[PDB]
Structure 1
Amino acid sequence: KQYIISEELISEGKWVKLEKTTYMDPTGKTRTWESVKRTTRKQTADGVAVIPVLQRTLHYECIVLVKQFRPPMGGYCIEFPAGLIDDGETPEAAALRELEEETGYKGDIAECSPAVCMDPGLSNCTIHIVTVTINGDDAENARPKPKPGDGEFVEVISLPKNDLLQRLDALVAEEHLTVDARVYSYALALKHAN
């Protein structure tokens, strides 16, 4: 019933462009929308986010998170490890790669979502969410070696899964970080379960 009529470029950077979308509303009336897209999509999705489940025996199961300065935010954010999927990379491989570069952990794929939207009232950005377990007891994850890209500077934060939401709230109150919305959602559902 609704669909896109045309997309007018307003402005195009190296990474991000702004368009004005014309669309047919369900009443038969033409309407416009200001839309953001990345200029880098190729790929099933722009990116991947990894839910990394750090499993070490006789320890609480942890969820591995990253903290970075996010220039659009103008401060530091706590997020699942993530990046853009390389041209002709699979989502699963972007996930393991990004997870390694950002945290140094070597993990195994548990499952992989379809492409899901990040902020669909604003942008077309999508990601695959990739659940990955990390055998914290293998020698390769003993002193995990984070190999960041150029211009990435990432702190690694492992929080117990069974207390994640309370832990995140503690971090925000005590540290002025912003928690990612997907991370916060995950944490909520851990509490809302059962």
Structure 2
Amino acid sequence: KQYIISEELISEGKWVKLEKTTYMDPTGKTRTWESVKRTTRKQTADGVAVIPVLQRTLHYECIVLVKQFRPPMGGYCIEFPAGLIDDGETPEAAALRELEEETGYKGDIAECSPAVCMDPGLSNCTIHIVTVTINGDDAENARPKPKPGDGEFVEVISLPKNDLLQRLDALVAEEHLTVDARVYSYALALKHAN
């Protein structure tokens, strides 16, 4: 019933562009929307986010998260390990690569979402959410070696799965961080499943 008529480039950076979108509302009235897109999509999605489940015998299961300075936020954020999918990279392969670069952990794919939208009122940006298990007991995950690309500075924070939401709330109240909306959504559902 609704569809795009035209897109007008407003401003194109190296990484991000601003468009005015003309679309038909369901009444047959023509309307405009200010929209953001990345310049980097070629891919099933722009990015991957990894839900990394660190499994060590006789330990609580942990979710592995990363803490980074985010220039748009002007502060530190707690997030699932994540990055843009390389030209000709599979979402699964991008997930294991990003997980290893950001955490040093070597993981196994459990499941992979279809492309899901990040902020569909603002942007066309999409990701694959890739569930990965990490055998914390294997030699390769003993002293995990993180491989940061140029300009990437990442701290690893592993939090117990069974208490994730209370642990995230404590970090926010203590360390003045911003928790990622997908991390918080996952944490909430772990509590609401009961």
Deviations, residues 55-87 of structure 1 (Å, cap 9, x unaligned): 000000000000000000000000000000000
Deviations, residues 137-189 of structure 1 (Å, cap 9, x unaligned): 00000000000110000000000000000000000000110000000000000
Deviations, residues 65-118 of structure 1 (Å, cap 9, x unaligned): 000000000000000000000000000000000000000000000000000000
Q: Structure 1 segments of 4 or more deviating over 3 A?
A: none
The runs of 5 or more residues in structure 2 that have no matched partner are: none
SS at match of 1:114: coil
The offset of 1:31, in angstroms, is: 0.2
Distance 2:123 2:172 in 1: 27
How many residue pairs were aligned?
194
Distance 1:150 1:129 in 2: 24
The offset of 1:130, in angstroms, is: 0.1
The offset of 1:136, in angstroms, is: 0.2
The offset of 1:15, in angstroms, is: 0.1
Distance 2:64 2:144 in 1: 12
Q: Percent identity?
A: 100
The offset of 1:6, in angstroms, is: 0.3
Distance 1:169 1:139 in 2: 33
What value does the CA root-mean-square deviation take over the aligned residues?
0.3
Distance 2:26 2:39 in 1: 29
Distance 2:42 2:142 in 1: 36
The runs of 5 or more residues in structure 1 that have no matched partner are: none
Look up the match of 2:32.
32
Distance 1:3 1:66 in 2: 38
Distance 1:168 1:57 in 2: 23
Q: What TM-score do the two structures reach when normalised by structure 2?
A: 1.00
Q: How does 1:130-145 map to 2 (within 5 A)?
A: 130-145=130-145
Distance 2:24 2:150 in 1: 43
Distance 2:148 2:57 in 1: 28
The offset of 1:27, in angstroms, is: 0.5
The offset of 1:4, in angstroms, is: 0.2
Q: What TM-score do the two structures reach when normalised by structure 1?
A: 1.00
Q: Is residue 170 of structure 1 aligned with residue 170 of structure 2?
A: yes
The offset of 1:124, in angstroms, is: 0.1
The offset of 1:133, in angstroms, is: 0.1
